[model samples]
Target: RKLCSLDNGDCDQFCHEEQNSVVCSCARGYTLADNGKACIPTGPYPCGKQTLE
Candidate 1:
């Protein structure tokens, strides 16, 4: 039996339960964040890009 639920993992993109562990992952164009449980963009998106003065 699994000890964790999908909603309880707090994964930003995807979550899966296997044996006694919960695996977290990100979708395309995104990578794992510093927290190791969330996902952040791999590169600057159109609206997320920064500009220089």
Candidate 2:
């Protein structure tokens, strides 16, 4: 099975296969940060504080 995660409050974020590995990305209202795992909100919605633990 593949592992997946999404933005703070986004329900549209998803992951897809890309060659040998899977890629997780955010939808229109979200923006991916440098960390790749931290999906930030770009639209009206706000992504509140989050912890990695």
Candidate 3:
């Protein structure tokens, strides 16, 4: 059964609902932690030092 809503699906960053089960995932610049349920920041996630000119 879908468990995404069941306590964030135990995800640290994002939660995704699969066919019958849910998965924990993260966005860009991040990766699953050692527990495979948490997310660890590995990227800058994009930083714009300069503005559009």
lDDT of 1 by residue, 1-53 (tens): 34246465877767877676777777787887888678887766623347653
Clashing pairs in 2: none
- Candidate 3, residues 17-51, lDDT tens digits: the string is 88867778877777788786988877454232244
Scored by lDDT, model 1 comes in at 0.69
Give the Å error, residue 52, model 2. 22
Which is the winner by lDDT between candidate 1 and candidate 2? 1
Candidate with maximal TM-score: 3
- Candidate 3, run of 10 with poorest lDDT: 44-53
**How does residue 42 of candidate 1 score in lDDT?**
73
**Root-mean-square deviation per candidate:** 5.2, 7.8, 5.8
Candidate 3 total steric clashes: 0
Off by over 4 Å in 3: 44-53
Answer with 1 or 2, whichever has the higher TM-score. 1
Instruction: Give the TM-score of each candidate.
Output: 0.60, 0.51, 0.64
> Model 3 compared with the native: what TM-score?
0.64
